Amino acid sequence: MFQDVLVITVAAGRGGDGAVSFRREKFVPKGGPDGGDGGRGGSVYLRARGSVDSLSRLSKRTYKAEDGEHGRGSQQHGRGGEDLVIEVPRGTRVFDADTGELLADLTEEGQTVLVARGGAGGRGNMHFVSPTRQAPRFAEAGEEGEKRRLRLELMLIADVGLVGYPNAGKSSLLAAMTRAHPKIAPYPFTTLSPNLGVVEVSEEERFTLADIPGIIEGASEGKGLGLEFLRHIARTRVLLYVLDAADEPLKTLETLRKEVGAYDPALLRRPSLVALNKVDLLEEEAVKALADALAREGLAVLPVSALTGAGLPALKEALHALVRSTPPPEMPKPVPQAGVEVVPVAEGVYEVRAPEVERYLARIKGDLMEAAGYLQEVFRRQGVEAALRAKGVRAGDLVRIGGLEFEYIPEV
């Protein structure tokens, strides 16, 4: 996990414009409507894939799905744009980068979520023919596609991840540091269930520790902890290297850091600490000698004992301080139309608030004057006429809506 947090920009495809066309024959002064419908714009989706390890390979360019194709004559409908799928790791939280709203938690293989809807294609002139309109000279432009900023963050298995070989005594240490007994936590996004423990600190706060036990070969066999383990431990905020003080402590740490680095150099930069374990039978001078030699490796070293409790207070505080120094997971912000509202703006002037209608009106293509009837039809079926009538707006008043204006004429 090189990148556990990232903000990307996505934009669905704009639907295609509807066509205003008429059949043309050498001896037919005016053929009927020929305009075809535009195609739907492509949508943008995010999909979880176990193969994608972090957010590091995403992109800076805005992810743009394909626009729909404009309609054409001969009653030819434009083709829809292709969808765009953005692959992210399993265990990815998807937030609106501005809203803070949680769109989804992608944890399963191939789990998908729609993050931006492509705009509908515009209807051609042929679609508006009626008894009064034999040859419509207007149409619908394509609808714009949704656009938004997405904040992605990798789900953690714990605040601190324990790293070490079986001889380090990781489980006994974790048990000694926690009050409540550690529990197996089978996250939906993991393939290895970590043992989770909660550490009670001073700042009334608290942090979690993760250990993934295994029956494997010793560091001597040179086979490491494995990539699967590392990909799991990468989902933590701080790494605690645990070592067996009586078994090549120095060489074991170098072997651990080397493997963690080979997997992802960034993991070595993550706030880390070393817990020197199994020092119960060592003289104080020997422990100090070990510590100093190990500290030279770059990380702070704290000696600990599960049997005496020695060094544990210092370990909990040093970890607590390390976790607090790293950005925490963000909390999902509070969850938070065909509405029609007539607002007076002056004597005889009423501004109509109607999101859907306003956006529709901005898409009218062609002869606007000729669309007057049709738009009046839409206005009624959308409750605009009713909201005006029941509002006291009287005949002759001016109504402003979606940038256009019209003289209110009551229903007889």
Could you please describe the fold and organization of this structure?
The PDB classes it as protein binding. Keywords: GTP-binding protein, Obg, TGS domain, RIKEN Structural Genomics/Proteomics Initiative, rsgi, Structural Genomics, protein binding. It forms a monomeric assembly. The entry is titled "Crystal structure of the conserved protein TT1381 from Thermus thermophilus HB8". The protein is the GTP-binding protein Obg. Organism: Thermus thermophilus. The protein is of the alpha/beta class. The chain has 3 domains: 1-154, Spo0b-associated Gtp-binding Protein, Chain: A (Distorted Sandwich); 155-328, 3-Layer(aba) Sandwich (Rossmann fold); 338-411, GMP Synthetase, Chain A, domain 3. The chain is 20% helix and 25% strand. It is built from 9 helices and 21 strands. It has helices spanning 170-177, 227-233, 249-263, 266-269, 284-295, 312-324, 355-361, 372-381, 384-389; strands at 5-11, 44-48, 63-64, 84-88, 92-96, 102-106, 112-116, 138-140, 147-154, 160-163, 183-184, 195-200, 206-211, 238-244, 272-277, 301-303, 341-346, 349-353, 364-366, 398-401, 404-407. A 7-stranded mixed beta sheet has the order 11-12-13-10-14-15-16, with helices on both faces. A 5-stranded mixed beta sheet has the order 3-1-9-5-6, with no helix packed on it. A 4-stranded mixed beta sheet has the order 17-18-20-21. Strand 17 and strand 18 form a beta hairpin.
